Design a protein around this ligand. Sequence first.
Ligand SMILES: [Mg+2]
Ligand SMILES: [Mg+2]
Ligand SMILES: [Mg+2]
Ligand SMILES: [Mg+2]
Ligand SMILES: [Mg+2]
Ligand SMILES: [Mg+2]
Ligand SMILES: [Mg+2]
Ligand SMILES: [Mg+2]
Ligand SMILES: [Mg+2]
Ligand SMILES: [Mg+2]
Ligand SMILES: [Mg+2]
Ligand SMILES: [Mg+2]
Ligand SMILES: [Mg+2]
Ligand SMILES: [Mg+2]
Ligand SMILES: [Mg+2]
Ligand SMILES: [Mg+2]
Ligand SMILES: [Mg+2]
Ligand SMILES: [Mg+2]
Ligand SMILES: [Mg+2]
Ligand SMILES: [Mg+2]
Ligand SMILES: [Mg+2]
Ligand SMILES: [Mg+2]
Ligand SMILES: [Mg+2]
Ligand SMILES: [Mg+2]
Ligand SMILES: [Mg+2]
Lengths: 132, 380, 62
Amino acid sequence: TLKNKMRITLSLPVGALINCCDNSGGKNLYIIAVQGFGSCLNRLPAASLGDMVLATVKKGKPDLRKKVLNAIICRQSKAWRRHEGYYIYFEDNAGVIVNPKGEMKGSAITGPVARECAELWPKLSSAASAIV
Amino acid sequence: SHRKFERPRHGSLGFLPRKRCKRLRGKIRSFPKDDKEKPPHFTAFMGYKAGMTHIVREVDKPGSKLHKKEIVEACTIIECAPMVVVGIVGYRETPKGLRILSTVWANHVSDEFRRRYYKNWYKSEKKAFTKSLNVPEATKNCLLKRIEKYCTVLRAICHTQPSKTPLRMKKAHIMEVQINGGSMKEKLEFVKEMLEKNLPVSTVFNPNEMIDVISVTKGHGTKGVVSRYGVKRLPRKTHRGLRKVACIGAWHPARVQFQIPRHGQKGYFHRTERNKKIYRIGLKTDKNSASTDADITEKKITPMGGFPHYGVVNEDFLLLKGCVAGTKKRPITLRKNIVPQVSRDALAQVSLKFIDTSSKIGHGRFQTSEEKVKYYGPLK
Amino acid sequence: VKTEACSFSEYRIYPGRGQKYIARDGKVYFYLSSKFASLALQKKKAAKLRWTQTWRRNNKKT
RNA sequence: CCUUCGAUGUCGGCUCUUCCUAUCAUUGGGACGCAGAAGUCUCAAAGUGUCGGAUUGUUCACCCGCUAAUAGGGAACGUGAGCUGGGUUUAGACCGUCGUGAGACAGGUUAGUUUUACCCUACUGAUGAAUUUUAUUAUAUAUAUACAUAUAGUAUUGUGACAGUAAUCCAACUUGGUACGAGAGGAUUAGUUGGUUCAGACAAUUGGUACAGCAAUUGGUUGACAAACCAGUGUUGCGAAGCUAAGUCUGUUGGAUAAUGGCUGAACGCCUCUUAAGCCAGAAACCAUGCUGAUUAAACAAUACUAUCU
RNA sequence: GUCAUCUAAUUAGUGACGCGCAUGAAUGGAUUAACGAGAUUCCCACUGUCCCUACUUGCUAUCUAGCGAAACCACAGCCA
RNA sequence: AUGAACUAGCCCUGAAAAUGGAUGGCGCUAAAGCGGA
Ligand SMILES: [Mg+2]
Ligand SMILES: [Mg+2]
Ligand SMILES: [Mg+2]
Ligand SMILES: [Mg+2]
Ligand SMILES: [Mg+2]
Ligand SMILES: [Mg+2]
Ligand SMILES: [Mg+2]
Ligand SMILES: [Mg+2]
Ligand SMILES: [Mg+2]
Ligand SMILES: [Mg+2]
Ligand SMILES: [Mg+2]
Ligand SMILES: [Mg+2]
Ligand SMILES: [Mg+2]
Ligand SMILES: [Mg+2]
Ligand SMILES: [Mg+2]
Ligand SMILES: [Mg+2]
Ligand SMILES: [Mg+2]
Ligand SMILES: [Mg+2]
Ligand SMILES: [Mg+2]
Ligand SMILES: [Mg+2]
Ligand SMILES: [Mg+2]
Ligand SMILES: [Mg+2]
Ligand SMILES: [Mg+2]
Ligand SMILES: [Mg+2]
Ligand SMILES: [Mg+2]
């Protein structure tokens, strides 16, 4: 699978709390790290709508709690530019729990998923309902 | 002791004496290397900045995510009225640098060229270039033979025509354009044919060419360290204010070093930028100079309501991809690359699908002024 | 040149202008200016404002 | 116990620059108990980097992470007329041990004032005259000339000594499930597409900003309508132009080398990269090219006009 | 200090344990509803404290007419 | 007229630090260096 992902505006820094968007049992997610982030003195790591993150679950069924997990961002509230020449934004921020290799722990996504996110992960595209 | 945490330096020490420039005009510091196997040709030009707009274009990159999509890009417009060639100068090489033999002028010159030699032309007798045009041509030809025999570099003196723009200025801008190409004699022959004619901009450049730009940035005055160098901002509890650098240096190098950022003048700097691509060379004899194959609406480049802060463009122009330093009306200098490039982007040729001409005052909604009256119907 | 409507005040949107908003369900909305986006996001109705094409269609003013 | 007791502000952090190499990563090499992969020892080399957090006043520690790597240090233990004031280190007060007692404790605890730059210099930007014991990399008609030439004023176009200097790292796919290997595994180079951190600009689009402007409205006051005003910007919605990032564009190639590996060839009839003479290839290092300045050279040239007078 | 709890991660907070350097009974011991500009930890709401800074108003500073001090001062003020 | 061992003069390896620097400086190799006359 190719990994190109033309740049997207980042607005979801570390310490944000977002919805969980799937049927795995959790209700929210708490971002604590972002893969691929480098070094810069006072800067916070931040993620956009195709990246994989490390998160914990603050509410949901007890066996999912008190652990570090993997997640993938599917919707975001900050606007971003599409090369066709317009701007897009959702209402809320959502993500799903996955494997370190990007395989879901649940079996269904609830709401719409972004068209850029589905181009990078084939299982998420297969399990989606409406791609926008 | 050592600093606790590392961070790269703030400014760039290569643009360092951040003082105001000597002039409006951008000066070429070095020219492209002469390839004596090409035919003689010009190397530079000059015009004025008008404004910006956007276009729609199709992509031809196999392997990219955008390989078959129409995309939007931003472009800049430069007004390019023709210049006039009025003189010849020849240099020769000495161990102290290039040196001049003589300058040779044309038989006639215009008044906007002569105004550039006067602080206040309106109260003068206007006696510049009045006795040295009656020189016999025999002396001129002897001087040209000497230039041919003893020199190694030619340049041509050219000037612009501000009367064909919406500018308030009437003095013409003067510059030298080096001529690369064949032998010295061929160079001299090439130049002499033009001593009183016009250069169109289309003679000097080609469609889909890559070009370098020289101009002077916008001026802002005195600006603080936070804005001038982008240093960190300091905590709100600080007693004498927070917009500064805390430590100027260690104790005992017992001075302030030149690398420390300080307050001072920002803007109005001289710059040279590389690799700006040409998208269209429009003319003034063409009525539909902003229409495409996919949009047959008859249009000129000027947006509805005039270019904001400039005026109307009714000469031939260049369309450049990207941005250029300077304000509106700032004179822009255009040089060829030092050596020609052969990359995948330098050779690729561009076909356009739409050029926007809606109003830039406010939020434009129509492409021509007839659509506006067609939409509303009769008014009161 | 291809163009499509504003979904709040059905003016025509030329390329390089617009703004879209995906709702709770997969509905797509497409405004052109900041004024219309702000008005729609404050939940105002186009039929209640005098200058929109919806008001003067319901008043037979065309 | 040499300097300072008619006084050199005493912990740590934050901010900012520069230097060292005893090299963690990135560049080219040599060796292995070296099949590949992953490592270990070592050479030239300081050009470019060396992070986000929980507990503690901490320096020091110790965990959670990402990363290419999260190397070690100096500059009056860099840095208080730069800040801050949590600790220590005056006067209040509590506890424990000690003391007949007043009181002590390098044992805990809580509350406790951080003053002055307009001077010199350094550094950052801004105006600006005066330069004959002065200068010259030619001029004039193949010949002559330093035993020579050079005035000033106002303008334009140029030369360029010297000083500063800039880019950096990564991933995916192809090569190719291949060379190597019994298997398990499994890459060097090269290409293509993107990205990180830096640097220089810009405002077509998106967002931010309001004492241009238009509209709405509470209390009060002009008899009412209309028109207005006060409440130090009464409050609210939209808000052009301009400025601006979180938005957009741009960021080269040559010369001569160090390590190492080689050529021809004596000393020493064989041999030998030279541990003689004579040569070759060769690194993110060096010098140019390119870029910024050039009252940094008290520096110069060509040109166009004008100087009751060379 | 050991065990549990709170976090992703706890020299901090809480609940237990006790051969307690050096705890203990009007030098008062153990509790305790209400009250406190008293000392600490965690949660919800909130935000320019921060990521990362930008734009704006009054009053200064600035240049003019007028008026007009002081501290300090061996002599002075480029470097290796 | 070839082998081996040993000995001692000049030279070389052992030989890494923080602002840019010090046989006093320039520089000096048919010495302007070291041991003599
Ligand atoms: Mg910090
Ligand atoms: Mg304070
Ligand atoms: Mg506009
Ligand atoms: Mg309408
Ligand atoms: Mg003293
Ligand atoms: Mg002192
Ligand atoms: Mg003192
Ligand atoms: Mg060692
Ligand atoms: Mg190697
Ligand atoms: Mg290596
Ligand atoms: Mg100190
Ligand atoms: Mg020390
Ligand atoms: Mg102080
Ligand atoms: Mg301190
Ligand atoms: Mg100090
Ligand atoms: Mg204190
Ligand atoms: Mg006390
Ligand atoms: Mg706006
Ligand atoms: Mg605006
Ligand atoms: Mg306890
Ligand atoms: Mg008793
Ligand atoms: Mg007692
Ligand atoms: Mg004043
Ligand atoms: Mg000194
Ligand atoms: Mg001597």
